[PDB]
């Protein structure tokens, strides 16, 4: 940033830039700053992208001490508000002066570092890369099996698809949480139930997708979402299935197809789905000829079922470095 | 506790006392400890009751600072094993002083400043009077129907007795949390709601009885241990009814049988039973005499209720100054 702020010494900027320059340069808190060791000086309404650029580079500083002090520490004394929150409230300030260097005829000059920089961060964000978590089926059985038992109504694994289906429906409309504090937990029940904690507790914009290991019924993606609506996620992530073993490409579009039938998920789903095809294990158990023209056939179907519900599909392609994976 | 511990200079006592004192010589912690103005030399197993009433007086310290701090802040870096926690955490050691002179010939000694100190701890405790919540019972039904209404499941206030008893007992039985945090709460209910969450971060021995205005049916008693549990009151209080108008004065012997008759309730009650009798509105609707002599008859029936179900039933008599009340 502080590169940055050097080049876009310019004093030319439309009304909108001049203004907001002149909104910072308000709150300018007339200090040494002394803990920078270039522009220590507040900035002059002069050059008016270098103060923009200078609130950008204050909110920058208080973003690093905060995530530094947090991950040092279990906690942090820096005011969020002195930070970058929002994927874009980053964004904005180079927004505005990408818009002002066009409107003053500088667009050779905003496609050089500024742009650079918009790129990254439009790229990259508050956290490098988003953060996928992968989970197997069956372990989300046993939390949801646990608590029906707990909860004296049976037991989740005996349960036919269709009794978990209807009872996991319920559940997600309806308002009433489901655990409490007293939910007897394996330590790999709160394994899970843990790691969705942590999924609540942190920025949304650091997670990606949560991937469903051994995923065959839709009982284990509303399960997922059922456990992150209980488990208080804030911005629940999406769920995404992960087909792998050969039986679970041929009967993955039945099962697609199924999990749209539900009105609920396809209306929460907001028209985008993604499911991923994983390439490892099935030219393991099975022929690998066999398993490609599966996975072909696969990729064909899943297209066509998310055609004819209207769902916008994006697949995953779970593919390794040898040709054998 | 100082004067105390300037008496308290024998030099026998029993083993048990040596043994203590000894202990606390042991992690006497060799500091300077200058906050005390006297006694501030680590005191010498020489005079072990002062060894003893020492640590006392290190244990009052950190609790007088940790309930000024939480006063005057909102927390307190205080550590709670510094304190006393209990309302006889404080009496143990003192206790043992009056073993250890009593064993040693010294009982007059024991009852002098000694006993003084161990009838006033053991009166007045860590909080100096046990301290009552009492509210209106349709404030109490008001929540519940709210929360009936918000889980979709019908309006507590429209429901018969009957319906509102079942209900409510199966919500004690059961292991479900009730509410979330997304329950639409008027002023007054959240008024209640977080009377109760009050109730549930302050230590129990600062509360006393929980006094039901307007109690006519083992429902709002019900009613008052539900919200208890559902508010995650660690030891709920106990929970009392105030018959004060003459109808209820008449009905209160029946509503209070009808109360012991879930055995549920007379279960959990632990044998006892305090229900409060006013004194103000009784002579106001009806004559004095009328009043007096309905109190009077209410009095006896109640008694013959309680003993009816092995209830050792204790009774509040909410006199006034005047005669009239
Ligand atoms: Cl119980």
Same mark, same amino acid.
């Given at each position: 940033?502080?590169?940055?702020?050097?080049? $876009?010494?310019?004093?030319?900027?439309?009304?909108?830039?001049?203004?907001?320059?002149?909104?910072? @340069?308000?709150? =300018?808190?007339?200090?040494?700053?002394?803990?920078?060791?270039?522009?220590?000086?507040?900035?002059?309404?002069?050059?008016?992208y270098?103060?923009?650029?200078?609130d950008?580079?204050?909110?920058?500083?208080?973003?690093?001490?905060?995530?530094?002090?947090?991950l040092?520490?279990g906690?942090?004394?820096?005011?969020? %508000?002195a930070?970058?929150?929002?994927? %874009?409230?980053?964004?904005?300030?180079?927004?505005?002066?990408?818009?002002?260097?066009c409107?003053?005829?500088?667009?050779?000059? /905003?496609?050089?570092?500024l742009?650079?920089?918009?790129?990254?961060? =439009?790229?990259?964000?508050?956290?490098?890369?988003?953060?996928?978590?992968?989970?197997?089926?069956?372990? @989300?059985?046993?939390? *949801?099996?646990?608590?029906?038992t @707990?909860?004296?109504?049976?037991?989740?694994?005996?349960?036919? !698809?269709?009794?978990?289906?209807?009872?996991? *429906?319920? %559940?997600?409309?309806?308002?009433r949480?489901l655990?409490?504090?007293? *939910?007897?937990?394996?330590? %790999?029940?709160?394994?899970?139930?843990?790691?969705? @904690?942590?999924?609540?507790?942190?920025?949304?914009?650091?997670?990606?997708?949560?991937?469903? =290991? $051994?995923?065959?019924?839709?009982? +284990?993606?509303? /399960?997922?979402?059922?456990?992150?609506?209980?488990?208080?996620?804030?911005?629940?992530?999406?769920?995404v299935?992960?087909?792998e073993?050969? #039986? +679970?490409?041929?009967?993955?579009?039945?099962?697609?197809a199924?999990?749209?039938?539900?009105?609920?998920?396809?209306?929460?789903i907001?028209?985008?789905? !993604?499911?991923?095809?994983?390439?490892?294990? =099935?030219?393991?158990?099975?022929?690998?000829?066999? #398993? /490609?023209?599966?996975?072909?056939?696969?990729?064909?179907?899943?297209?066509?079922? /998310?055609? !004819?519900?209207?769902?916008?599909?994006?697949?995953?392609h779970?593919?390794?470095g040898?040709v054998?994976?």
């Amino acid at each position: 940033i502080e590169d940055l702020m050097f080049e $876009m010494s310019m004093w030319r900027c439309n009304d909108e830039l001049r203004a907001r320059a002149d909104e910072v @340069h308000a709150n =300018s808190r007339k200090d040494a700053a002394k803990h920078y060791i270039e522009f220590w000086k507040s900035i002059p309404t002069t050059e008016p992208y270098r103060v923009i650029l200078g609130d950008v580079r204050d909110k920058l500083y208080h973003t690093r001490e905060r995530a530094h002090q947090l991950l040092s520490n279990g906690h942090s004394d820096v005011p969020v %508000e002195a930070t970058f929150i929002n994927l %874009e409230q980053f964004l904005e300030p180079l927004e505005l002066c990408y818009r002002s260097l066009c409107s003053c005829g500088d667009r050779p000059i /905003a496609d050089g570092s500024l742009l650079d920089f918009l790129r990254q961060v =439009s790229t990259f964000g508050l956290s490098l890369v988003r953060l996928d978590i992968r989970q197997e089926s069956d372990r @989300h059985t046993d939390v *949801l099996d646990a608590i029906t038992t @707990h909860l004296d109504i049976g037991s989740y694994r005996e349960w036919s !698809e269709e009794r978990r289906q209807e009872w996991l *429906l319920s %559940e997600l409309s309806g308002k009433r949480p489901l655990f409490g504090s007293d *939910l007897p937990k394996t330590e %790999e029940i709160a394994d899970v139930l843990d790691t969705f @904690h942590v999924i609540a507790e942190l920025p949304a914009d650091s997670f990606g997708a949560y991937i469903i =290991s $051994m995923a065959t019924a839709p009982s +284990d993606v509303l /399960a997922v979402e059922l456990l992150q609506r209980e488990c208080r996620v804030k911005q629940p992530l999406r769920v995404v299935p992960l087909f792998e073993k050969l #039986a +679970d490409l041929e009967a993955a579009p039945a099962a697609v197809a199924r999990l749209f039938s539900v009105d609920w998920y396809k209306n929460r789903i907001n028209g985008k789905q !993604e499911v991923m095809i994983g390439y490892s294990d =099935s030219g393991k158990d099975a022929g690998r000829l066999s #398993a /490609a023209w599966q996975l072909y056939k696969a990729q064909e179907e899943l297209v066509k079922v /998310a055609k !004819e519900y209207g769902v916008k599909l994006t697949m995953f392609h779970g593919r390794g470095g040898t040709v054998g994976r």
